[PDB]
């Protein structure tokens, strides 16, 4: 009618106006994928970023672990052939817990944790567990009971595997904003998604960087982390995406390495021939063995990253501990280098 | 015993395989060998839709063959008037990681979802007069890969949690769950009567589901890798699938087996999207190599190419009137071909 066309042109003008504004926000925000290998400390790093500027589910995981212990104990006693605690004192501890049944606002007292661990290592309670399947039992009973020390540590942050053993995650993707030097960063953490990543990982082809968190002190989780990094680094849709690599949990590794109890040589045989790089910058006081260990792990990742994609995308390795307040500045400095290298690429100056 | 339990599935898959081979008496290539080819199909870009900030994952034509909706991971749904290129609505999404969008056949609603695991319904004709979300469908435990309205109050979804679900939009509840796939379900296509639908998954199998009952009727194998896309033949008796194995395949519901393979040596990338023309004679497939090929569905010959995108072609769609094709790309543009 030429007036319908006129009103469709004004509606289009009003949209393209808003699209210009929204385009300003989109181009001035850096988007980050946080990909954490299992039990990597990624959640702890996230909690730190939010505090400085998923964790709340810790109480639920506790509750599940407590329910599991209560069911195993009561059910174990009421079995047709009652299982017998190896230890009468352990049984007394069990009696305490049995009294501790059905109390809301449970304090989760440290004794309770010590009490729980004692009952778990009680072979009679384990014998119940053998027949635990017979009675109704909570599915994540072994997993929670084995990880009791981690849960007891007040600083404990529920890990993704723990959130998956329970069913406390509804949201597919978790978001967290932070700001450094008035630059905006949008970091995305994968929530309820299955462990098959080859499809949903393609959504993050144009993030500024993928923050790969790896628990350095594992050994074989380190080798699993290596395979994942390799697939990410060689995927055709991620070939232009840089990777900020956080070799996390360096404190755990220093502790494990000085002890000698587990030799990285058994899991990675070539270590026995690895010499520390002649350009390594160790911490001021750490000994050569932890420096050799931490740089061998880094060189296992750099060997993958330097084998392909020299000019298109880059790997920024950082020896980190999940509670460093410098993680935010490290991300900022790598993103600056990433964007700087992109613009220099457009001008053919690199 | 799991051992014999697994061994009677070998005989049952042996029973099904010989029963499918008895049916196979002549190849579709032999039935259509003496029909004339379609000749060179040479379509041109008639519209380039500009305005999405980032890669487009999905698009869906309205039933009026004029309006369409597109979803980009900038966090925007845009409803375009394809005739004038004017944008009718710009819907800011709560979660920017959108992977699918759907246009209701009545024009009253659009749906979209993604890594948020939610199917969000948007009312386009609110009595107050502004576009706003009217329903959030939160049941899935994995990313939403595809959604299609049956009507204003019913929508089928497919998810990375290896299931499909039928939803009651009013109650927000999950009415029926379709299980049996053992991989990410990537795409679904409603039969023209909306009594059945097919789904393609990352187990290299397509499954035919009964919407009313809620069970799988038939399972179709033959693809070598993940199926990324699926589409019913216009008569509802067949469907085509596109896979990471660089192959499109046509499957017959009544013969219960593959009929034809659409493949060329020069093609080694996966298919992202497939769609038939109105008559079903042409099968249009979008590829990772930035092109869309036009296949002769009956003769398995390539009839043309839709070149002109500068990045991955993520989605295709043919109008209900068959007048035009729309392609969406990671280059953030939609093109209308004719």
């Amino acid at each position, epitope marked *: 009618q030429r007036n319908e066309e006129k009103a469709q042109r004004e509606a289009n003008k009003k949209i393209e106006k808003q699209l210009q504004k929204d385009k300003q926000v989109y181009r001035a925000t850096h988007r980050l994928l946080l990909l954490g290998a299992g039990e990597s400390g990624k959640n702890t790093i996230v909690k730190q970023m939010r505090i400085l500027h998923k964790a709340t589910k810790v109480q639920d995981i506790k509750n599940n672990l407590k329910e599991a212990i209560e069911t195993i104990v009561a059910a174990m006693s009421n079995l047709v052939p009652p299982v017998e605690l190896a230890n009468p004192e352990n049984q007394f501890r069990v009696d305490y817990i049995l009294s501790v049944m059905n109390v809301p606002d449970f304090d989760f007292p440290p004794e309770f944790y010590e009490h729980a661990k004692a009952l778990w290592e009680d072979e009679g309670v384990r014998a119940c567990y053998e027949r635990s399947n017979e009675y109704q039992l909570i599915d994540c009973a072994q997993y929670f009971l084995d990880k009791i020390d981690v849960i007891k540590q007040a600083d404990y942050v529920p890990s993704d595997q723990d959130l998956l053993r329970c069913r406390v995650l509804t949201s597919g993707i978790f978001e967290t904003k932070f700001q450094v030097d008035k630059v905006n960063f949008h970091m995305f953490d994968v929530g309820a998604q*299955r*462990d*098959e*990543r*080859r499809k949903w*990982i393609q959504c993050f082809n144009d993030v500024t960087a993928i923050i790969f968190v790896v628990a350095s002190s594992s050994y*074989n989780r380190l*080798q*699993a982390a290596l*395979k*994942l990094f*390799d*697939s*990410i680094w*060689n*995927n*055709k849709w*991620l070939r232009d995406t840089s990777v900020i690599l956080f070799l996390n949990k360096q404190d755990l590794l220093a502790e494990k390495v000085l002890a000698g109890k587990s030799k990285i040589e*058994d*899991y*990675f*045989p*070539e270590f026995a021939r690895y010499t520390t790089p002649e350009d390594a910058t160790p911490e001021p006081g750490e000994d050569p063995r932890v420096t050799r260990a931490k740089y061998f792990i880094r060189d296992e990742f750099l060997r993958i990253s330097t084998a*392909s994609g020299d000019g298109r995308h880059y790997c920024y390795p950082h020896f980190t501990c999940a509670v460093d307040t410098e993680n935010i500045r490290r991300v900022f400095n790598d993103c600056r280098d990433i964007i700087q290298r992109m613009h220099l690429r457009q001008y053919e100056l690199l | 015993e799991l051992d014999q339990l*697994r061994q009677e599935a070998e005989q049952l*898959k042996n029973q099904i395989r010989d029963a499918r081979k008895a049916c196979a008496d002549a190849t579709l290539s032999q039935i259509t060998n003496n029909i004339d080819p379609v000749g060179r199909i040479q379509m041109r870009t008639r519209r380039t839709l500009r305005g999405h900030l980032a890669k487009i994952y999905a698009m869906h034509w309205g039933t009026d063959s004029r309006l369409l909706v597109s979803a980009s991971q900038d966090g925007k749904l845009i409803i375009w008037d394809s005739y004038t290129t004017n944008k009718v609505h710009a819907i800011p999404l709560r979660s920017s990681w959108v992977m699918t969008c759907a246009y209701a056949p009545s024009g009253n609603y659009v749906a979209c979802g993604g890594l948020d695991n939610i199917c969000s319904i948007y009312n386009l004709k609110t009595r107050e007069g502004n576009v706003r979300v009217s329903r959030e469908l939160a049941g899935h435990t994995g990313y939403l890969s595809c959604c299609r309205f049956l009507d204003d109050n019913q929508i089928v979804t497919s998810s990375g949690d*290896t299931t499909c679900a039928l939803w009651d939009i009013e109650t927000g509840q999950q009415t029926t769950t379709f299980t049996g796939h*053992t*991989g990410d379900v990537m795409s679904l296509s409603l039969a023209p009567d909306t009594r059945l639908f097919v789904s393609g998954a*990352c*187990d*290299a199998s397509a499954k035919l589901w009964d919407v009313r009952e809620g069970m799988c009727r038939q399972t179709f*194998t*033959g693809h*070598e*890798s*993940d199926i990324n896309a699926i589409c019913f033949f216009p008569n509802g008796n067949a469907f085509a699938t596109g896979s*990471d*194995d*660089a192959t499109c395949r046509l499957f017959d519901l009544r013969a219960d087996q593959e009929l034809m393979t659409y493949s060329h040596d020069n093609i*080694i990338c*996966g298919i992202t999207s497939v769609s038939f023309s109105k008559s079903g004679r042409l099968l249009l497939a979008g590829y990772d190599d930035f092109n869309c090929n036009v296949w002769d569905a009956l003769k398995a010959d390539r009839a043309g190419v839709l070149a002109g995108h500068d990045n991955r072609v993520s989605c295709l769609g043919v109008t209900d009137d068959g007048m035009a094709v729309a392609t969406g790309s990671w280059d953030s543009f939609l093109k209308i071909w004719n």
Partner: nanobody
Amino acid sequence: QVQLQESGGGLVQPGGSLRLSCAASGFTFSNYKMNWVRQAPGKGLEWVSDISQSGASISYTGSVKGRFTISRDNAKNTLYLQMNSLKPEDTAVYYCARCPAPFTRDCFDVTSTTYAYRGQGTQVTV
């Protein structure tokens, strides 16, 4: 239909040898990188070894380097794992696992709990 069926395995003494096989069918074997993966009793799936399409780029997990030898016969659509110097820690179900897409260098989901392009396995007890 894509089918992987592992052959071999059984019971051996420490230091003994064993030769596993993988009969593939339902895909162009030559276009896919192949994997051996295993699941020890109690623990999760762990990658063991892989091999490129032509059989030129080979890789092994650290625990088995020097002991296991992966190989593929592209003419007969068969994958092999010659296992020498077997240790009780090698006891697991060993799975033949194909990378999900052909002509690729990224091979993501082969150790996932549920993964489609992976055989039933074969029990190896040491």
